[PDB]
Amino acid sequence: MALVFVYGTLKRGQPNHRVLRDGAHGSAAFRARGRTLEPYPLVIAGEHNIPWLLHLPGSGRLVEGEVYAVDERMLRFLDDFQSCPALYQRTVLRVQLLEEEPPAPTAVQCFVYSRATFPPEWAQLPHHDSYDSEGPHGLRYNPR
């Protein structure tokens, strides 16, 4: 089992969220809303308008997303859905949980799909805090 932080097309309401719910792939259970503790550049790039968490921690913005508890079947499926390791890589980060003594913990370690190798100019594309395919940029995700 593991936790995965999703920020892109896998979030609730986004075009690929279904794959989290297809029991042929294993299990995924929503655990919490989260925000990265460190900023990253999250950019929409390429001809499908895919969102990419570029692996440049310490630059960009804090990224909002969702934490899911997944089984090992779902994690192996996701790795292949994301074309790892050629396209994305599964890396690790810590996330702030978005909702006294002792107080509740406010952070958790998760896997995330990040991208280490990219056209350098992608780093200067608009940085997003929260991705939406149907967001104000108009760059709708399109898998065609």
2-6 vs 64-70, strand pairing mode: antiparallel
DSSP string for residues in the chain: -EEEEE-STTSTTSTTGGGGT-GGG--EEEEEEEEESS-B-EEEETTTTEEEEBS-TTSSB--EEEEEEE-HHHHHHHHHHTTTTTS-EEEEEEEEEE---SPPP-EEEEEEEEB----GGGGGSPP-SS--TTSTT-------
State the Cα angle at 93 between 32 and 79, rounded to 5°.
85
Rounded Cα distance between 105 and 87, Å, is: 33
Q: Which method resolved this structure? A: X-ray
Residue 50, Ramachandran bin (φ over 0: left; ψ between -120 and 50: alpha; else beta): beta
Resolution in angstroms comes to 1.0
Amino acid at the residue 102: P
Instruction: Return the amino acid letter for 109.
Output: Q
CATH ID of 1-144, from 1.10.3470.10, 3.10.490.10, 2.60.120.1440, 1.10.3720.10: 3.10.490.10
Q: Cis before residue 105, ω within 30 degrees of 0? A: no
- How do the domains of the chain map onto residue ranges? 1-144
